[PDB]
Amino acid sequence: ENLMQVYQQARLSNPELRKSAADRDAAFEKINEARSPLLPQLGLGADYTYSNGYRDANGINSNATSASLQLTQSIFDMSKWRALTLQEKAAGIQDVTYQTDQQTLILNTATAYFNVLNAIDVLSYTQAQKEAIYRQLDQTTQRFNVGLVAITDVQNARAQYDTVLANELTARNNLDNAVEQLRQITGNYYPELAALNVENFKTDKPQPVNALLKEAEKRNLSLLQARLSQDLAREQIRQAQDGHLPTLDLTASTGISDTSYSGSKTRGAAGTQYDDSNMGQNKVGLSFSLPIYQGGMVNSQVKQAQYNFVGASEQLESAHRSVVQTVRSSFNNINASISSINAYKQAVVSAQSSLDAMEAGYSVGTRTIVDVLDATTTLYNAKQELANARYNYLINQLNIKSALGTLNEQDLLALNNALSKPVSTNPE
Amino acid sequence: ENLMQVYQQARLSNPELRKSAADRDAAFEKINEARSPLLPQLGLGADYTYSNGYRDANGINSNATSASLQLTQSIFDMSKWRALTLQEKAAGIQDVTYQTDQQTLILNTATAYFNVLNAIDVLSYTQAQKEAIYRQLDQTTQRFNVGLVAITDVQNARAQYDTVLANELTARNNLDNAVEQLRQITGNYYPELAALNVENFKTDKPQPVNALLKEAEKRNLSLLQARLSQDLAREQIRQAQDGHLPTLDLTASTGISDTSYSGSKTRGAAGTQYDDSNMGQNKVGLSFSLPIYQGGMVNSQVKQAQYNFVGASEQLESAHRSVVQTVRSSFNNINASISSINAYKQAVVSAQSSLDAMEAGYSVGTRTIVDVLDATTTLYNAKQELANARYNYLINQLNIKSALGTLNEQDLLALNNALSKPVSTNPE
Amino acid sequence: ENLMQVYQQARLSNPELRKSAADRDAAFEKINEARSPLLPQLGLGADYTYSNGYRDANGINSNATSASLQLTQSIFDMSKWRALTLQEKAAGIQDVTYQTDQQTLILNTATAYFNVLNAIDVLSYTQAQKEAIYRQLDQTTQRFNVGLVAITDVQNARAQYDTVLANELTARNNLDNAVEQLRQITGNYYPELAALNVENFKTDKPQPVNALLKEAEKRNLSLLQARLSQDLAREQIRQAQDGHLPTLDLTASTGISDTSYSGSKTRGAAGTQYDDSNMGQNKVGLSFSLPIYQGGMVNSQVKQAQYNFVGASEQLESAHRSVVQTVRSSFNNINASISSINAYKQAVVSAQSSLDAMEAGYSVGTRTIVDVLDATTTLYNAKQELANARYNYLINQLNIKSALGTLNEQDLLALNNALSKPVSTNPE
């Protein structure tokens, strides 16, 4: 019904933003996977075996039956902590992109609303045009029958009347397409939308350029993601270096087994070596490692990290200059919109004066009714142009708010106060 | 040189589809790779060693030589089966992409075929306009040199003539570029192509929108691939829980090793402990292992998989909305084409009257040849626009049917009745 | 100050090209880590272990300690050589993309340079139009005050004045944005730039298309990329087949150990078997293996590699076709530009004549000052067209040289000879 309600529904219905939220959640979950290797480990290895001697070594047999648990726990390894830092950076990146997605959704909802309104206005204008052209065709046909013109004039009138029929059909197709494209965002059919009230339309002047640029350089999203990217590149440089550092880990276990034997040929001159025995082992101990002369395996891995970091630093500079140009362009666009609005208001007044003149002439009997209809068509065209300009101005203010990096739902709340009168999308 | 003969060769010459076929064949053959690990594996293990004890074990020399074979057969580990399921689903996705590429090939070939003929028509119009503009220049120059006209008029006529010459050059270049575009798809240069048979054109009517929507939901390619992706995500979730499952393997090995003992200490009072032996080994056994805690890593992979699944579901919903809006748009486009065809038909009906009236006046002597030529140019304009409208209608029919996903080559009678005598592509 | 200087500054100040260089450096450095697995891989170890396993031996204490080195050196394996070759091919690919980035930088700088002059021309002519329309409004308002026209005609003049005001504002904003976009390439603000020298402009004729095609086949960067990628696919096919051949390795080690026990019960009539030891060993040996049966792993890789090879061949064919098409399209754009230049020259001459006629008529009193202002505006616009045409010709020559694959600073130098007139980028 209103813009606020439409956005409220689209917020909790839209699938793209929900995909962004799901991706953020799955990314925050990778932190747990990062820490897991640090914590202890536990396993089991029970098994069995059967040997056999041959090639003059027959008559000797054995039976293995093992079962043991194992605990492993690392006590010093800096590589693992690098992973946790990197995962935290990834979580930050995901949050930033989620914010960008929300802002994009706000922009798209506003754009769809205003597109629907513009379609309504254009449809009305084309209907008026069709009426005028039909009236003109009737006059020309009536004159030809009377005997004042030739067949070619009637043919031209019919062509002009046929063209407007195609334009009228196209307008309805555009309106239906706009309604469906709004449903694609919101997910619902909206018979009516609130219309702009001209009594309280705002044309406030914007702030200086340098202030806007300075504020944007603080809480913008693209450059924030660039900064986080450079930080994770540095964290990636740290990770590479720790490949040539020693580490320690602890190992523990316990197990039992039975190792009885059997056989006839085994008997004889055993010498106590062929006796059944049961045994267990409970080894526990630490370990250490340290690499040397690896052919610069990790040494050359470090140089790759530094080049990547300088590339990230270059991308950040590119992002900075891009933000500069974008904000400047948005500001100039706002100014152009103001000027265009003024021009269109003047045009509307001129058309109104012409229509009044044409109507008075007809009332006194100096003009036909085709002139009245043509004047009406011109006035409706001017009204459509003015409405389009107003909608573009509102969209541009929202766009500069987005470029600044400070777009929310409370900002859009104010715009709702400019929309008062309901209008049907497909009136009967 | 009709569409069918051009498309038959395009089918077996187009590298865009051939790459898709190669990708599908790579995807399919890859399954046999994933079934390899389950089967048994054999290998050889010969090697050599040499040792020299020190510290307590001084003066002890030894040398060893061994060689054996190994064979491991996985008894129960579903991890490998889930790989097969995932890979077959990947093959399905690839086949869907192949179907999409085939439809794309068909549509692109048809579009290029019509573009060539459109270029030819506009070229003919430009030639007529050039002739008319030249006859105007001659008229003005003769007048000026006899009087009746200032020089500025001569220069204006010269300017118009130069402009039409530039347009003619542009049209020739466009005609060559479109042919080059027709050689880039099919792979052959076509000097002559068939054209539309105007006397047998069909302005058919489309089916209701709801029936198209149902057919699309049932048999559309994009949403089918999306459903395959959703099933793949579920299978991946099933694969995540596979971690907790225990695994066991059956391994058997055999080999020989003949080791001899020597040394001053060994000789003398050996006591049978240091005597040489020539026994073999035929070890056969099993193995079983299962994780107990693992620090909750799998309990995190399970949640990552669930988040991925919900993201895939959101993607599928988005694709559904997209297909709905696309089918609606295509239907509206067909209707718009019908209306435009009617409008242009009336427009050409009208222009014929004026060129007919200009000719009679010259026959009696009320007009000049310049009027006749200008009328001819206008009618040529009415002729080039109508042909463009017809070609657009045909392409839009193909587009709606492609949105339905139901066209590969059943456009046999669709265009066969629409062909006519050959028309050259690059006349000289 | 001028084109050559701007390019010189951008050659080293442009971040995109520097990122490309960083990528090239990363690719070349990668060769080092492919070499590394050939050299010896020395290492160090050390681990204590306490054990009291007592399935049958209760009260036995046996600590353990060890510390040893390691060395490994591969003898025969073609898994590493293939990696070296493939990394070299990747480096070549990176070099080619770097060269492409160079050419892109030159093109972007030239386009950004010419857009500023276009903006200057547009601004001047828009200001002239504003002056003319203001004089028209003054005349109309005076006439209405005198009592010769109706109020309706005043509104039209006011509307036109507002429209021209808006157009002028848009022109100024476009000039500002074009200045900013050139700073996004070089990082500097240019108060003034050099303009074209009209009396020193050349109109050459392009070389025959066959020679251009031959040169493109010789030295087109994208085709070089395609051929290198295909070679990289063939070498990968060779790599896959090499998973069959056997492998040979050499290892060596040396270390110590204590394995000291304790306990009163152990001491006494132990038979010397349970006494503490301080043994040491320096074992060294080789290790060989040759696979026999691996399943479809060996078989499937080769078929997949061949499929990838045919895919690469298809991609190369696409590259060839695209190159030919682009060469012809640029070659034709050149001639189109020549023709447009001729047409706009004629238009300028015609406008000059009209202006002179108007001026003489006003000198003798047959015309109002308003008429003169309009002719000046028409002439001024005619120089907007002719200026924007020559810049298009230069840009098109630069593009065709780029497609030929021979675009260097030497080529860009030839343009600057025609730019020998400074002009401000911000009038008043």
Curated annotation (Swiss-Prot), chains A, B, C:
In vitro, inhibited by hexaamminecobalt(3+). Residues 53-60, 258-278 are extracellular. The chain crosses the membrane at residues 41-52, 61-74, 247-257, 279-289. Changing residue 362 to F: Partial channel opening. Increases sensitivity to vancomycin, by allowing its passive diffusion across the outer membrane. One of its GO terms (molecular function) is identical protein binding. Gene3D superfamilies: Outer membrane efflux proteins (OEP) (1.20.1600.10). It is a multi-pass membrane protein. Forms a continuous, solvent-accessible conduit: a 'channel-tunnel' over 140 Angstroms long that spans both the outer membrane and periplasmic space. The periplasmic or proximal end of the tunnel is sealed by sets of coiled helices. Belongs to the outer membrane factor (OMF) (TC 1.B.17) family. This is Outer membrane protein TolC. It comes from Escherichia coli (strain K12). The lineage of its organism: Bacteria, Pseudomonadati, Pseudomonadota, Gammaproteobacteria, Enterobacterales. The gene is tolC.
